[model samples]
Target: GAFAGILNDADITAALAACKAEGSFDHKAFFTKVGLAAKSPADIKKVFEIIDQDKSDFVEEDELKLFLQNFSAGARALSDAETKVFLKAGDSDGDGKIGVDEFGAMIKA
Candidate 1:
């Protein structure tokens, strides 16, 4: 939310148009285009902390599904496929959940 260049639908639309490939929402590309990748580790941590609202120190699929909404209040929920890809990219340990380091790596990658 605070780190990415996102504030509304228009912003996401711009990112989407720039990064979306052949009609599919590429979460990795989208995050990169939206400037999340440019953020410092502390900034990434802040958003990660906010997204992990359950305070488990890891983000589950349930929380992952609403990732876009948390980042941008006006953004639509991510497509199911998009969520899967996002989870796949961030769940580095294959535990089906995203740890903070995994999240940072996903965006920073």
Candidate 2:
């Protein structure tokens, strides 16, 4: 797909491994090493802008889901339960919605 960033073999391997790391998935170091840190509020907005291809000012759940779905290979590759857990982590408002701030909090969490 067009959204899939072009990655070399080693990167593809690492990404796959990261997703499959079961139970605990820490994206802090991984995201930081990639020059994308979303630890703070500002950092969170930066991440939202980077991934918000539509520039809609807000990232909907589907957008987030699509990115996760294709983060590497394997559509349900990260484990269905795990994927849902990740998504719920980002949806902080409990309204089944996630804004940039919420997403940032999730990354920081």
Candidate 3:
């Protein structure tokens, strides 16, 4: 009921149908139209947790190096500068070893 909406929006449904006519999935247009730019903090928060490839309990500043790819497959990379800022800025109410809760707070912006 809740999470399904991420893939169940009317625009996505309508756009998905258009891709079948083409040889490809049309993800470029699809993601561009309804991509991670949407300010839905709820969805991104849960998704962001999986990026902790450092094998720790939470996220590391360096871990966000490729954060944009998670935004979508057809995506951009993160800036090392702001990637650190996401941690510096994200370290809200805590120091380091942050998670979806902390970093997502900045991403919500």
Candidate 4:
């Protein structure tokens, strides 16, 4: 797994800013900032914070699989199935792990 872009702090900030600016679902916004849009990207770890509702950064395959199930059915935020022929499209690496780089690309792209 390429963690180069996924682990960069600077890129993480930029991506979070962009993602938060594009979406308003602040389920993960610990401290909401004024003048900041909701589409901004979140801290790479925070992505886990949200996904890992159970407080685990390393999401298990089952957890990710379930997440994909609802997300693919348009039951969650972000891109829905109509946006892509398949939810797997978002997992560009097909590694079953969507890291910061993947999340960043989703918004910036």
Candidate 5:
């Protein structure tokens, strides 16, 4: 519902088609074009601070798991298998941890 106010099906379809044609889409480019990039760095940092439950300056698998578990009321908690895959998707450096930029990328993705 929240996104419905900001995006429509045609926008989503065009984005997907562009990504398919290009092999992959640049997260920043996509977010900027879609207006999600209106969030200032401070706003993003605030989100990172909220998600970084341990205050370790990074989001680890455990934090991500818990975050995903509560992501949506209509969705079930992510399973162990799903959590691992989700974390891996955002752990760009294969460091088993997600930095702010990586988290942003994941959100944009």
Candidate 6:
């Protein structure tokens, strides 16, 4: 819910488009283009870190589900089927998890 202050449909669309253009996800660009309107770069990174709950420098499916719950107005975590599809999109190495680079690719798609 707190993340509602950060992302919106338009913001998400633009950020996704930007990521697609670069054929990768760049945290700085996503923040500058979408998040910076409401949150500072430092703050954005903090949020990303929070999503990466394990502090593994990567965002796994569970963490992503948590992020979506917090970020979406729906207030519900993603389902297993949804999670698998979403993770697959961004898990470039088929590692079942997403690093920043993989996240970018996932966003680009």
Q: Highest lDDT: which candidate?
A: 1
Model 1: which residue pairs collide? none
Best TM-score goes to which candidate? 1
* Candidate 2 per-residue lDDT over residues 1-109, each given as its tens digit: 3223332345434644665555444445445433344245565565566556578776655565445444443633444554466567767767665678777666555
What are the models' TM-scores? 0.75, 0.52, 0.48, 0.33, 0.56, 0.55
Taking the candidates one at a time, how many backbone clashes does each contain? 0, 0, 0, 16, 0, 1
Error of 1 at 92 (Å): 0.9
lDDT of 3 by residue, 1-109 (tens): 1224464456544444544342333333544444434646677665555566655757776666554444344444456664565566657866675766665555444
Give candidate 2's error at residue 83 in angstroms.
4.0
**Which residue pairs clash within candidate 2?**
none
Q: Which stretches of candidate 6 lie over 4 Å from their true place?
A: 1-47, 72-74
> Is 1 or 4 the stronger prediction by TM-score?
1
lDDT, candidate 6, 59-86, per-residue tens: 8878865544444444445556656666
**Per-residue C-alpha lDDT of model 4 across residues 31-98, encoded as one tens digit per residue:** 22211223446544454445554654444344543342322232233444323322354456876655
TM-score of 3: 0.48
Candidate 5 local Cα displacement, residue 95, angstroms: 0.5
State the C-alpha lDDT per candidate. 0.73, 0.54, 0.53, 0.40, 0.59, 0.59
Task: For model 6, name the residue pairs that clash.
Answer: 25-104
Candidate 1 on 1-109: residue-level lDDT in tens? 4445333455556775663343366767777656677777787788788889799999998888777666566656666777788789888889999998999998877
Q: Report the error of model 3 at residue 68, Å.
A: 0.3
In model 2, which regions exceed 4 Å deviation?
A: 1-16, 20-40, 68-82
- TM-score order, best first, reads 1, 5, 6, 2, 3, 4
